[PDB]
């Protein structure tokens, strides 16, 4: 996250964090039951092998909270390619489940039609992650999160060195330098109504990180409310 | 729907909510049947 706040303790409980086999992490998750994280597709390729950790707010430190799962079944969305990036989501069921508490909960997946008219509509989301302070920079140790503006799409095609599907949407600044970056990619993006925050997005990709002209671009969940369903359904 | 999202806490006249919530009496609130209900930010 390049900008943004860290986290204050239980305020992004649905944070994972995929960690490689060194132990170190490179994509982000969301938290959907005590079984299954949501991811995205592209992280998949970044590991050969790897684990999901939850509880985790500062990678330096083992904290109270603190646990790791192992990847039972991998669900990606058949239609990814890195040749356009659509369908960039990917559905991991833990192999033992996951135990509620502080900071660790899952984020709400809303309704289809009421998504797109209520939860879409809104200002703003926030999108978190361990992922790089800056473009060329490292990787956070501490877990930050970032209130991001919903970009209009067509503002966002004309921005896009890439083209920009049904199945992602645009979300940051324009020339502001806050945006979410290599790292946070998985992780989650959500969007509060009233006092509940429900999944909105994946955090996808983007050219570059803050760059002026360019926005963050997720993949936008809403189209995939029943593939989630029937994942998650086995 | 289209206005006040129907006085709903959640989901849109008739409210509804997400898995681990309840509908309200007033049907329109939504009650949380477990101490870590989805999208709610934790506290000790
Ligand atoms: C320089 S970096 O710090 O090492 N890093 C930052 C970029 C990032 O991810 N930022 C980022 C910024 C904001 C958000 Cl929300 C997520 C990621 C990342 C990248 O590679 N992005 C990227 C760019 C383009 C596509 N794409 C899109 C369509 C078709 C084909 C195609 O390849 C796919 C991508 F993976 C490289
Ligand atoms: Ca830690
Ligand atoms: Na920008």
Same mark, same amino acid.
């Given at each position: @996250? ?72 991998? @669900? &990606?969305?058949?239609?990814?390619? &890195? ?14 489940? @996951? ?57 966002? &095609? ?77 | ?44």
């Amino acid at each position: @996250i390049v900008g943004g706040q860290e986290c204050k303790d239980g305020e992004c409980p649905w944070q994972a964090l995929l960690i490689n086999e060194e132990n170190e992490g490179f994509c982000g998750g969301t938290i959907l039951s005590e079984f299954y994280i949501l991811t995205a597709a592209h992280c998949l390729y970044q590991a050969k092998r790897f684990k999901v950790r939850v509880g985790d707010r500062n990678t330096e430190q083992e904290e109270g909270g603190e646990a790791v799962h192992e990847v039972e079944v991998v @669900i &990606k969305h058949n239609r990814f390619t &890195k040749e356009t990036y659509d369908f960039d989501i990917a559905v991991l069921r833990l192999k033992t489940p @996951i135990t509620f508490r502080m900071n660790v909960a899952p984020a709400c997946l809303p309704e289809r039609d009421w998504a797109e008219s209520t939860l879409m509509t809104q200002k703003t989301g926030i999108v978190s992650g361990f992922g790089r302070t800056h473009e060329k920079g490292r990787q956070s140790t501490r877990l930050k999160m970032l209130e991001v503006p919903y970009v209009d799409r067509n503002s966002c &095609k004309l921005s896009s060195s890439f083209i920009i599907t049904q199945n992602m949407f645009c979300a940051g600044y324009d020339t502001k330098q806050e945006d979410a970056c290599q790292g946070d990619s998985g992780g989650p993006h959500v969007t509060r109504f009233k006092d509940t925050y429900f999944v909105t997005g994946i955090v996808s990709w983007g050219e570059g990180c803050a760059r002026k002209g360019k926005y963050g671009i997720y993949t936008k969940v809403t189209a995939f409310l029943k593939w989630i369903d029937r994942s998650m359904k086995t | 729907c289209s206005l006040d999202n129907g006085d709903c806490d959640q989901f849109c006249v008739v409210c509804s909510c997400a898995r681990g919530y309840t509908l309200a009496d007033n049907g329109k609130a939504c009650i949380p049947t477990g101490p870590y209900p989805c999208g709610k930010q934790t506290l000790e």
